[model samples]
Target: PGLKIDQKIRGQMPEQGWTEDDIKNTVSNGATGTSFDKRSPKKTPPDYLGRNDPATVYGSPGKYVVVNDRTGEVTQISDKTDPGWVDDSRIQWG
Candidate 1:
């Protein structure tokens, strides 16, 4: 329905190595259409997948955005490995 930037963003910003302002703008700009299944929250190179139709958003020059599909909450913002790709299958999982 609507983008709901969850409080998780506060912690994710630092953990993902991004500034607050940058994240704000990313959400405002909309998502990248590319999405994947939720990754392992307790496993992966990161924590918590955006779940619920989670999709990616190009937030900055260095990283990409993984937003929770339903909540609109950004689930991840990690280093861009390849052309805006975040291979959920390759990430660490439990």
Candidate 2:
């Protein structure tokens, strides 16, 4: 419940390859550990559900890339690399 500061960031440098749109749209891959399926009987709120998954790119099941746009903490590459989350890593925050 607290924010930590460290120099080991991943997307902070303007020249490090992160864009305004990318920073604004990127989603936290570790936010929730639950997935929805029919008959699971679990549901999210209207604001949480019926809404975009933050990142415009598709990130379903074993397919996703997490980019830390704020602190440049870490860039995650999923094992299932099918170009599912490759925007060519072409977005800058300058």
Candidate 3:
């Protein structure tokens, strides 16, 4: 049998119905690593710009001002919507 010692690894809350076995299983699989809080806000990857990019000026339908991460081409949306294939970054929330 493997000897176990107490270990302390921080974590975020999981789903509401998680059981003790589930928690142990998750910890065993993932607790060895920590970089950023997966539950917290993270910046968009340089290769893939997400909707939260600072370029987006959001409203009801939202407006996007995107600087294409690849081509460095910038696009803007005025007080209108549906210019073309808007990225997920165009979605707006209250």
Candidate 4:
């Protein structure tokens, strides 16, 4: 429990809550908020323009891409896989 996230949105999908686990997991999958969605791995990140940056396509808050120490590859998203994580209060299904 590195970060204690409020459980208010716990029952929603993973896309909504900004918990530490959610952030860590998302970062681990190479998802850089909304900017680097389809950029090549070889290319430099447009900048640390994460959710905090105005460069976001969705223009929301999120984390940066993290390099997996073991694989040495960038991962941008992660979260515990479970019903609680799958259905949360932050994001809604369209």
Candidate 5:
């Protein structure tokens, strides 16, 4: 069994004699009735994808909005398009 500690969060853990197995077992046992895969150096995504720079509405190029994937909030409207909106896949009809 191996545990992956995040470099950003490493400082939050104990500094002495902690093995990958030790952390893995502790986390595994702590979560009851839930199964997780065993692996080394596990990393997690940020809690929030948060807000992104505004993207332009293709058909409505005049309009722009910031998309927050995590919160699902559409924000900002302006005359200029944010380069972030160039991806064709992200445009969807709703």
Candidate 6:
């Protein structure tokens, strides 16, 4: 309610392919367990090397959601898997 989704997560947006309603849908219906959010593209992501490391890849390259659970704000809309990938501490909004 405080933080509106105006910033892009690695140039990705909720409206890039999916709609805001779709994102609002993800707000709850989305499957999440640990690190963050992910939706498989079912193929090698274009960022395999461009934006990702060739080695030490843990999860597939699908879009990730930086959800501020406490603030009830979804901050990010990019594809960055964890486990040897970008750490939340580095990008986590204060």
Cα TM-score per model: 0.50, 0.22, 0.19, 0.21, 0.23, 0.38
Global Cα lDDT for candidate 4: 0.32
Q: List the residue pairs that clash in candidate 2.
A: 9-72, 10-72, 10-73, 11-72, 18-91, 18-92, 18-93, 19-91, 19-92, 19-93
Candidate with the larger lDDT of 1 and 6: 1
Cα lDDT, all candidates: 0.53, 0.31, 0.28, 0.32, 0.31, 0.38
Task: Report residue 79 deviation for candidate 6 (angstroms).
Answer: 5.0
Tell me how far candidate 6 lies from the true structure as C-alpha RMSD in angstroms.
Answer: 12.3
RMSD, each candidate, Å? 7.2, 13.6, 18.1, 13.1, 19.0, 12.3
- Ranking of all candidate structures by their TM-score, best first: 1, 6, 5, 2, 4, 3
Q: Of the pair 2 and 4, which is ahead by TM-score?
A: 2
TM-score of 2: 0.22
Task: Give the true-structure RMSD of model 4.
Answer: 13.1
After superposition, candidate 6 runs with Cα above 4 Å error: 1-3, 7-11, 36-61, 79-94
- The sequence of per-residue lDDT tens digits that candidate 6 reaches over residues 1-94 is 3434533432355334445555565544443423433313332133222112111112122434455444333444444323344444324222
lDDT (Cα, tens digit) per residue for candidate 1, span 6-70: 45556566655667677667667755445553645542323354243545555544465666545
Top of the candidates by lDDT: 1
Give me candidate 1's TM-score against the actual structure: 0.50
How well does candidate 5 match the true structure in TM-score terms?
A: 0.23
Residues 1-94 of candidate 5 have per-residue lDDT tens digits of: 2233444334433333234344444344332221122112222334333333333221232232222233322222222324343423344433
Report the number of backbone clashes for model 4: 24
By the lDDT metric, which is better: model 1 or model 5?
Answer: 1
Which of 4 and 5 is the better model by TM-score? 5
| Model 3 quality (TM-score) | 0.19
